[PDB]
């Protein structure tokens, strides 16, 4: 029988849970929340790799939330009180989800979530496992990772290599691979899976040596490795904003980093509330090349994988949550040429390509609000879809790929965001978890709860076998020279290539007029 007050083992000591979700569900779930999987990165630790997690005697209580990693409130919020939650640089804890009837041996599969954010807002606890873990039989761990100038500050040399947040998730797998079997997962059947920074970190995983051996799947929902924000050849624009906000000036990075290390929570905070986003670099331990040279590498070994995207990732909440959303409002006919020069700086291009984007995306189109809605697809592809293609095509001579293209406008959003917004940015997330952030209920049509269930059945058979098919769900061939995906939305169907005019002007057409 499920004890209602779980006590578990781990390599640093004993944890006790609680039984929820008796009522509700099938013989309910057990939570251990707020788990240490490395050092508190504080001190002389900032800026430095994680270390293994002190031990302690007697049952360490494992019913509350860990702190968030310091972060703007403001931007997640952007994205309740949120000020009356713990926030902490001592952060490195993760959560676990289990079946009640899971103890030490039951070997169920394991699926690991990396939260997204942009590298520097989120936290574990949004993500509630519980219905995840009773409606398909897993384990469901929550992970946590350093972000913003505390995760992802480099100096470029010894001093500060950087991606401090990615080696924290490789330190939060390496624990799992260590203890989850104490929990009842099988350590030989983890599958990591995660939405926009936290597809991009699991993508990155993939890639990266040392996280192999760390997990047997992959499922990267609406961001890859290749994410042009995210992935970074130089650390100069970071490291100098830094510099000039923290009054570390003048100093070479072995000064620079040890000025940093004498700030304070406060002034971090201050430091950080810049940065709407921070990008990994080629640090040396985690990156020991670019993950473009990885990818194209004739020794990648990926894991199976499912990668995917929505029809308008930068539909709504990213340009709102970005700050934007009023330059896209005033575009029209007259600015529009402006706008794309402006736009193919920011996009790494000259600014001659601006007639190519526009003939591309804009066309003879004269509507303002269609040349908005135009601008935000091209931003989608550019950010999202591209990327997704040509890693989905790196991997797929290698290992099973399944490739998805989520279609679905979620109903709770038809009166709150423009109608013309079709599958938004982590509109997928609740159908994964059958709930929104914080586990809160949604009004779910019946159609949207047939969705959810295939969703989660499809995300849960991948974890079992590498292969998301099973009976009563509709056929999801594998990725191949036919460049099949399926199109997930109230009456799934099968597709094939992808915007493939779009991934032949970015990849090819447009580097060849670079050229010239
Ligand atoms: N939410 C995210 O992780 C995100 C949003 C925009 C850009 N990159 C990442
Ligand atoms: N129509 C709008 O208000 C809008 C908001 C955000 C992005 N694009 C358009
Ligand atoms: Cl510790």
Same mark, same amino acid.
């Given at each position: 029988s499920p004890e209602a007050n779980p006590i578990r083992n781990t390599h640093t000591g004993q944890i006790q849970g609680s039984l929820i979700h008796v009522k509700d569900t099938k013989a309910g779930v057990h939570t251990f929340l707020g788990? &240490? #999987?490395?050092?508190?990165?504080?001190?002389? %630790? /900032?800026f430095a790799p994680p270390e293994a997690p002190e031990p302690w005697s007697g049952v360490r209580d494992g019913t509350a939330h860990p702190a968030m990693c310091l972060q703007n409130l403001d931007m997640l919020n952007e994205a309740?009180? %949120?000020? $009356?939650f713990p926030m902490s640089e001592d952060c490195l804890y993760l959560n676990i989800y289990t079946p009640?009837?899971?103890?030490?041996?039951?070997?169920l599969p394991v699926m690991v979530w990396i939260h997204g954010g942009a590298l520097v807002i989120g936290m574990a606890?949004? #993500?509630?496992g519980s219905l995840l873990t009773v409606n398909e039989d897993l384990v469901v761990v929550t992970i946590q990772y350093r972000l913003g100038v505390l995760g992802f500050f480099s100096?470029? @040399?010894?001093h500060a290599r950087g991606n401090w947040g990615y080696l924290d998730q490789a330190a939060a797998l390496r624990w799992v691979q260590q203890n989850i079997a104490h929990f009842g997962?099988? &350590? @030989? /059947?983890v599958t990591i899976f995660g939405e926009s920074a936290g597809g991009t970190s699991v993508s990155s995983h993939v890639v990266s040596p040392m996280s192999?051996? %760390? #997990?047997?799947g992959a499922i990267m929902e609406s961001?890859?490795?290749? %994410?042009p924000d995210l992935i $970074?050849?130089? $650390?100069e624009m970071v490291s100098t904003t830094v510099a000039k906000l923290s009054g570390c +000036?003048?100093?070479?990075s072995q000064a620079l980093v040890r000025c940093l290390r004498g700030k304070s929570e406060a002034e971090i905070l201050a430091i950080n509330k810049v940065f709407k986003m921070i990008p990994a670099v080629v640090?040396?331990?985690?990156?020991?090349?670019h993950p473009k040279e990885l990818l194209a590498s004739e020794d990648f070994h990926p894991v199976p994988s499912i990668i995917g995207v929505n029809?308008? +990732?930068?539909? =709504?909440?990213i340009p709102v949550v970005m700050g934007s959303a009023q330059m896209i409002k005033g575009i029209t006919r007259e600015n529009l040429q402006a706008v794309l020069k402006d736009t193919a700086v920011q996009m790494m291009?000259?600014?001659?390509?601006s007639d190519l984007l526009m003939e591309e995306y804009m066309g003879d189109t004269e509507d303002a609000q269609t040349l908005q809605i135009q601008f935000t697809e091209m931003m989608g592809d550019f950010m999202f879809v591209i990327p997704a293609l040509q890693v989905a095509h790196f991997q797929r001579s290698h290992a099973p790929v399944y490739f998805y293209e989520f279609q679905h406008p979620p109903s709770y959003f038809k009166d709150v965001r423009? &109608?013309?917004?079709?599958? @938004?940015?982590? @509109?997928?997330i609740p159908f994964v #978890?059958? $709930?929104?952030? =914080?586990?809160m209920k949604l009004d779910f049509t019946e159609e949207e709860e047939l969705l959810s269930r295939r969703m989660m059945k499809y995300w849960a058979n991948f974890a079992r076998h590498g292969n998301p098919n099973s009976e009563g769900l509709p056929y999801w061939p594998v990725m191949d020279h036919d460049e099949q995906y399926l199109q997930l939305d109230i009456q799934p169907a099968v597709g094939r290539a992808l915007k493939a005019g779009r991934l032949q002007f970015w990849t090819k057409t447009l580097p060849q007029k670079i050229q010239e």
């Open positions: 788990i &240490p #999987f490395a050092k508190p990165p504080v001190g002389p %630790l /900032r309740m009180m %949120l000020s $009356s009640a009837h899971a103890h030490e041996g039951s070997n606890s949004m #993500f509630d100096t470029g @040399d010894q997962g099988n &350590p @030989d /059947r192999q051996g %760390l #997990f047997h961001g890859v490795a290749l %994410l $970074s050849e130089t $650390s +000036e003048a100093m070479d640090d040396g331990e985690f990156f020991p090349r029809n308008d +990732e930068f539909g =709504w909440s291009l000259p600014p001659e390509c423009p &109608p013309h917004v079709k599958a @938004d940015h982590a @509109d997928e #978890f059958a $709930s929104f952030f =914080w586990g």
